[PDB]
Short mmCIF file of C-alpha atoms in Angstrom, two decimals:
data_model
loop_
_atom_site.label_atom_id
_atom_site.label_comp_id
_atom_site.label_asym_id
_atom_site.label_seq_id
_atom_site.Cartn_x
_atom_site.Cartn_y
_atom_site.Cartn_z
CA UNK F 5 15.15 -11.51 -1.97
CA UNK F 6 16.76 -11.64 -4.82
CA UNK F 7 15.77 -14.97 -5.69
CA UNK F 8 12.20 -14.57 -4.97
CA UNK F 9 12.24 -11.81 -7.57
CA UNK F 10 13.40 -14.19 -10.18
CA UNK F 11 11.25 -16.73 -9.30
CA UNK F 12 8.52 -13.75 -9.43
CA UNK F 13 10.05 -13.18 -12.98
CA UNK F 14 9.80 -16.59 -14.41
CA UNK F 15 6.52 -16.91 -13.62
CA UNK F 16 4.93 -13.85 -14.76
CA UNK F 17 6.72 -14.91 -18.04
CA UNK F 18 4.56 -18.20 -17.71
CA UNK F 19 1.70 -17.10 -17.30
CA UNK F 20 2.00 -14.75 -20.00
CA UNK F 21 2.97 -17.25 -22.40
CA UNK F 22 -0.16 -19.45 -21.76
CA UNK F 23 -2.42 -16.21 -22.07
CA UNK F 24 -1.40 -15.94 -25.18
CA UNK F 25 -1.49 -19.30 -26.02
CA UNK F 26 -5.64 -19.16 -24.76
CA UNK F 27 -6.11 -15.76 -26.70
CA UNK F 28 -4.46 -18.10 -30.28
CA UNK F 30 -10.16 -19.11 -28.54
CA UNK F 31 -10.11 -16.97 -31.52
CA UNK F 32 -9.21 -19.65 -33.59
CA UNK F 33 -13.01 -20.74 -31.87
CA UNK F 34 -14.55 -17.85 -32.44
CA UNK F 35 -13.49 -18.34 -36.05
CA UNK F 36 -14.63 -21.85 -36.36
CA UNK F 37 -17.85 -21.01 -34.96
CA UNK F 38 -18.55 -18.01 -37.08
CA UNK F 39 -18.23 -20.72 -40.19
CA UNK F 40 -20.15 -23.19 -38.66
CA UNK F 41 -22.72 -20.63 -38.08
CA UNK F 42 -22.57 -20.29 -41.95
CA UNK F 43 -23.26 -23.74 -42.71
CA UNK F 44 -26.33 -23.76 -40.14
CA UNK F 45 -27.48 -20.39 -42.32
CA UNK F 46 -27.30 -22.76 -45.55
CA UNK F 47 -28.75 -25.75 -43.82
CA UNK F 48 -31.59 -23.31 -42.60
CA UNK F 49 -32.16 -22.58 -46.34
CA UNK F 50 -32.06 -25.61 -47.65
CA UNK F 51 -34.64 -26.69 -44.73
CA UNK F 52 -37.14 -23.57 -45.35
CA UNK F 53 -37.35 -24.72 -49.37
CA UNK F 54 -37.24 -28.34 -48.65
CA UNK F 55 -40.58 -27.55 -46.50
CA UNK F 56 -42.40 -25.65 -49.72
CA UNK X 170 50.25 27.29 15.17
CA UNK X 171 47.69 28.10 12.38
CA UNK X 172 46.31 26.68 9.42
CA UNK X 173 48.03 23.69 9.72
CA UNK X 174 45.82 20.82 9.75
CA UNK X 175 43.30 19.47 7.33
CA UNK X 176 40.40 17.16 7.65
CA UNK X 177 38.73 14.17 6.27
CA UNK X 178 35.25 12.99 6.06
CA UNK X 179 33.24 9.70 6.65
CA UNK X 180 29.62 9.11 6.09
CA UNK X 181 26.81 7.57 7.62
CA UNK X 182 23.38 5.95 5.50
CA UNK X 183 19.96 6.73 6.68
CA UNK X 184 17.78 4.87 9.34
CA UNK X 185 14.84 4.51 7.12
CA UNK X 186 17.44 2.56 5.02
CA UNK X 187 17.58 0.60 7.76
CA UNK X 188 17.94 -3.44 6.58
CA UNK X 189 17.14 -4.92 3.03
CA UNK X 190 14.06 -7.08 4.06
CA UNK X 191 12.21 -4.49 4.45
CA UNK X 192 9.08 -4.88 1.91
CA UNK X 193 8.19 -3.38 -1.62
CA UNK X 194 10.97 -5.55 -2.96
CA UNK X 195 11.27 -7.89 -0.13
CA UNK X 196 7.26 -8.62 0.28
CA UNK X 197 8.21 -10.32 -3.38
CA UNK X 198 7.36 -13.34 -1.56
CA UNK X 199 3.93 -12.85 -0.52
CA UNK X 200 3.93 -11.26 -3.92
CA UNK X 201 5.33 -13.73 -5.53
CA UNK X 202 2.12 -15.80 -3.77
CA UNK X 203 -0.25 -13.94 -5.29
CA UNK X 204 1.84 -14.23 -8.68
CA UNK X 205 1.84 -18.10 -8.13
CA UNK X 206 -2.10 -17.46 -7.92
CA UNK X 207 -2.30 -16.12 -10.86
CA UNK X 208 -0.05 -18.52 -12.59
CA UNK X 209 -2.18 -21.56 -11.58
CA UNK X 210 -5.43 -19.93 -12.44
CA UNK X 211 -4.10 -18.61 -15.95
CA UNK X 212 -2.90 -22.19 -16.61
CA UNK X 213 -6.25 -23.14 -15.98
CA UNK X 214 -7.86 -20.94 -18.14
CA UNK X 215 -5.05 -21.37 -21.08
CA UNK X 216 -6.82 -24.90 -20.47
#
């Protein structure tokens, strides 16, 4: 029993490690929300390049 | 005679008590199954 407990221990500790780990996405979000910049200015540059 | 003998005391537990397999602490293995679940499918994810 006692055993099982650790082992039920360890793994939470995993897997709560490598949630973290996924939630460090952000740095996704982040990236995407400046690529979405760029595509503004390349948008821009597009619209004038058309008058 | 009179008031010349004393006493001492032993206890018994409860039945409830009864063994130490006996779930909520001992289920930990299915528990643990479902934790091992949850492991594999966060690992995923964190992937």
């Amino acid at each position: 029993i006692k055993f099982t407990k650790q082992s039920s221990v360890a793994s939470t500790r995993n897997t709560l490690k490598m949630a973290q780990d996924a939630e460090r996405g952000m740095n996704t979000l982040g990236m995407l929300g400046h690529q979405s910049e760029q595509l503004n200015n390349v948008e821009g540059n597009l619209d004038l390049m058309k008058v | 005679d009179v008031g010349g003998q004393q006493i001492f005391s032993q206890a018994l537990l409860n039945a409830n008590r009864r063994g130490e397999a006996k779930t909520a602490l001992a289920e930990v293995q299915a528990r643990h199954q479902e934790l091992l679940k949850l492991e594999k499918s966060m690992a995923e994810l964190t992937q």
